[PDB]
Every structure is written in structure tokens, then in C-alpha cells.
DNA sequence: CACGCGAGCATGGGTGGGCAAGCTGGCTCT
DNA sequence: AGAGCCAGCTTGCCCACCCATGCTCGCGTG
């Protein structure tokens, strides 16, 4: 019945967690990436056990604040009309995946929420993780889109059957100056949090 | 013994200060 | 000689205070 997807961490039986390696900088204190518009934001997928064949990785944005949570996260009308299309991403989608030949962009028939899915691929031998390159195609501040409202990215590991294997999430701010903004927010947390 | 009146209250709204956040300007760098 | 920084600027927006205005309340009246 809910149209709001869960943001609850579920590291699950496979021991699923994310890693993060200026265009992009991660704050572990905030669990929050600070990204520039349309720039690569690499996210690592770590598991303790190997998911089954046909496992998929989905990413979806939701507004972080209770008052906005039920509103679907979409690109603003300016960026939507911008001719920055890679050929596969529908222009209303905020989150894209770059560098994957099997990306699928979904628009939920019931909830109208946008997601982007790629096959899960096990790390190379001797590698601890697999990396997916996401891009956020609007600033947090975009008038008529996010409009300065913080978002969470929800990453789910899903079997081909649709069972939830794992779920992790991190906040995102897409902004002109990620370094400045990370420092500001961390100082605000230490001083007034 | 119902009503009239002046005092004060409640409650949405305005205002000024400060903040947020893309952007510009100069140096520096290569 | 184009480009990268870093500081500072710009500008919508937030926030707290105060105001605005219908209504309540106790007094006194008729
Ligand atoms: As990023
Ligand atoms: Zn936008």
C-alpha cells in the first residue's frame, strides 16, 4: 500500500554495504555524498557472500524530509529540456548510470518513481568490490526540481525474482562546490548538531 | 436578567535580518 | 595562453519579532 520505498538499511545475508572512494567527496560523519551536476559519483558494492546469478542493483532517490518524502524526485523542467541525453536515460530521470551496457531505466506503474538498474557483477579476482558510476543530472537547488530539498539515494540488491537481498542508502547534495559544502555541513554538525 | 461596552487575547501575516548557494573575479599554474 | 583555484558576490529564502483584527470576558446597565 505505501508508495514510499523503504530507506531502512538491510545489510542482509550477503553482508551488503557501500563504499565511496573535487567533483565528488563523501562525508562518513554525515553518510553523504557532495557531487557536482552530471559528474561521476562512483559507488562501491561490497558483499561478504556472492549473490546468486541474475542479481540486480537498483538506485532510486527519495526526499529525505518527512514533509517531502511522498513527492517523486524528478529532474527540473530546465534540465529536462536540456539536450544532454546519452540515448537511454529518459530526460526526467535524476540518476543515470554511465559505462554499463545493460542499464534499464524504470518508471513505476503505481508509484511513478524513477529508478535505474544494472546487473550485479562480482568483483574481479583479488578485488574486494564492484563500482558503479552514477551521475545526478540536477543540482539539489534546482528550481522546479529538488528545490533545495535533501535526497537519499537508496541502493538495493535484488534477485532476478524480485526478492530484496540488501538495501543501503546515503544522502546526496548535488552542488557547485562539494568541498566547500562538505566542510560547512561537518562544521555545522560539530558546532550546532 | 439579557445585553452593552471596553479591555485584552489568539492567531495569520508582515517585516527586517541573516542565510544559502550559484556564480564571478583575480591570481596562479601548466 | 587556456585553465584551475579561492575568495567574494549575488539573490531567493528562512526565521524571529511584531502587528492586525475577530472575539472573549468581566463589568455595569436597562
Ligand atoms: As558524488
Ligand atoms: Zn535541474
DSSP conformation letters of A5-35: PP---B-TTTT-EEE----EEEETTTTEEEE
Is A24's C-beta closer than 6 angstroms to any atom of ligand 1?
yes
Give the DSSP per-residue string, A59-98.
EEEEESSGGGTTSPP---HHHHHSS---SSS-TT-SEEEE
> Rounded to the nearest 5°, which phi and psi values hold at A127?
-100, 145
Q: Which nucleotides of C are covered by protein (CB under 7 A)?
A: 6-8, 13
Question: Which triple of cell numbers denotes residue A153?
Answer: 539515494
Residues A96-101: contacts with CB within 8 Å, 24+ apart?
A96/A134, A96/A135, A96/A137, A97/A59, A97/A132, A97/A133, A97/A134, A97/A135, A98/A40, A98/A133, A98/A134, A98/A135, A99/A133, A100/A132, A100/A133
Calculate ∠ Cα A168-A52-A126, nearest 5°: 80
Is A95's C-beta closer than 6 angstroms to any atom of ligand 1?
no
Cα separation, A56 vs A156, in Å, equals 8
The 10 Å Cβ neighbour count of residue A79 is 20
Dihedral, CA atoms, A172, A173, A177, A182, nearest 10 degrees? Answer: -70
Q: Which of A58, A69, A39 is nearest to A169 (CA)?
A: A58
* Domain residue limits at A57: 1-193
Element (H, E) at A170: strand A164-174
The resolution, in Å, is 1.8
* Structural domain total, chain A: 1
A6 contacts: CB under 8 Å, gap ≥ 6: A154, A167
Q: Specify the experimental method.
A: X-ray
Query: Which residues precede a break in chain A, with C-to-N distance above 2.5 Å?
Result: 21
Calculate ∠ Cα A128-A29-A175, nearest 5°: 90
Q: Which of A76, A7, A18, A73 is nearest to A43 (CA)?
A: A18
Placement of cell 540486480 in the chain: A56
Is A153's C-beta closer than 6 angstroms to any atom of ligand 1?
no
- Strands ordered across the beta sheet of A95-98: A17-19, A41-46, A130-136, A95-98
- For residue A75, the ligand closest to its alpha carbon is 2
Cα separation, A93 vs A89, in Å, equals 7
Q: Is A79 annotated as a binding residue?
A: yes
Amino acid at each position: 500500500s505505501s508508495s514510499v520505498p523503504s530507506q531502512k538499511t538491510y545489510q542482509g545475508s550477503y553482508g551488503f554495504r557501500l563504499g565511496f572512494l573535487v567533483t565528488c567527496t563523501y562525508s562518513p560523519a554525515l553518510n553523504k555524498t557532495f557531487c557536482q551536476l552530471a559528474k561521476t559519483c562512483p559507488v562501491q558494492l561490497w558483499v561478504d557472500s556472492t549473490p546468486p546469478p541474475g542479481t540486480r542493483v537498483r538506485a532510486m532517490a527519495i526526499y529525505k524530509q518527512s514533509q517531502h518524502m511522498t513527492e517523486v524526485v524528478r529532474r527540473c523542467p530546465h534540465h529536462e529540456r536540456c539536450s544532454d541525453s546519452d540515448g537511454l536515460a529518459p530526460p526526467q530521470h535524476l540518476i543515470r548510470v554511465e559505462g554499463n551496457l545493460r542499464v534499464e531505466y524504470l518508471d513505476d506503474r503505481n508509484t511513478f518513481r524513477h529508478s535505474v538498474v544494472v546487473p550485479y557483477e562480482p568483483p574481479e579476482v583479488g578485488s574486494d568490490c564492484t563500482t558503479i558510476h552514477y551521475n545526478y543530472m540536477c543540482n539539489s537547488s534546482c528550481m522546479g526540481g529538488m528545490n533545495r530539498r535533501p535526497i537519499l539515494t537508496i541502493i538495493t540488491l535484488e534477485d532476478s525474482s524480485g526478492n530484496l537481498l540488501g538495501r543501503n542508502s546515503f544522502e546526496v547534495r548535488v552542488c557547485a562546490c562539494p568541498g566547500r559544502d562538505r566542510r560547512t555541513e561537518e562544521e555545522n554538525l560539530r558546532k550546532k548538531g
